[PDB]
Structures are given as C-alpha cells and as structure tokens.
C-alpha cells in the first residue's frame, strides 16, 4: 500500500466561536470521583460545523478514551437525549 496527501482541501475552516478565558479545572465526572460535562451554544444563521476545539488539563492512561457528542437543546434550555454526532477520542 502507499500513502496520499490531500493537496486541494474540499473546504476551508474558520473559527467563529471562541471562549478563550480559563481560570480553573473541573473534573469531567465530578460526582463519581472515588474519595459528564456539557456546554451550550447557538448561531444566528445556518452554519456547517466541521470540527470542535477543546482544552484538556490532564488525561488518563494510554488505553483510556473520551466520547465527544453533540446533543440538541430542549425548549426549557437543557440538553436532550437526541445525539446528532458522536466520536471516540483516544488518549494519544
């Protein structure tokens, strides 16, 4: 087999939302540490989301992984059980 490089990209990405200020660390599962999180957003127009940006302060071992999902927001302003996207991110 042989490798291949995508020269002319099929799209160009642009960062439209960015919250850069950080002050603390919050465990992803605060209520089960021995001895999940979400963040809402919206747009004023129809936009094609291509990728996300996240910032982690620490991670687990090699074999651990984190599931990243995008879920909808219900009428009373809370996340719902519908999942529009899902992926698995390894520790590396």
């Amino acid at each position: 087999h042989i490798w291949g490089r995508l020269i002319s990209a099929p799209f160009t990405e642009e960062r439209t939302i960015y919250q850069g200020q950080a002050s603390e660390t919050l465990n992803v599962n605060p209520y089960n540490i021995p001895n999940p999180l979400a963040q809402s957003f919206q747009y004023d127009e129809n936009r094609t989301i291509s990728s996300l940006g996240l910032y982690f302060a620490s991670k687990g071992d090699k074999q651990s992984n984190v599931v990243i999902q995008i879920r909808g927001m219900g009428d009373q302003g809370y996340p719902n059980k519908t999942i529009y996207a899902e992926t698995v991110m390894n520790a590396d």
Binding site: A9, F11, T12, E13, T16, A22, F41
Partner: protein
C-alpha cells in the same frame, strides 16, 4: 465568559446542573466547501 452559553454537569448524562457563572474554554469551526478537491499519492 460566553454569554449565550452555560456550563453543565451531570452524574448520569440525564439530569444536568447548570453553572451560570462558568463556561468551558472551547472553539467551534465552521466550513465553506469549494468547487473541487485533489489528492496526490507518493511515487510508485
């Protein structure tokens, strides 16, 4: 930090406790597709 968003936490990914004064450090990228795409492979 982000006015139109709220940080949430949950013990079972069903009941969410909001944190009004806190938001994640994150960025969302939006794309605009073009006319054509091209791949090149390493030489044989």
């Amino acid at each position: 930090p982000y006015l139109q968003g709220v940080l949430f936490s949950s013990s079972n990914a069903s009941t969410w406790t909001p944190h009004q004064n806190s938001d994640l450090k994150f960025g969302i990228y939006t794309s605009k597709f073009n006319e054509t795409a091209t791949i090149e492979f390493e030489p044989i």
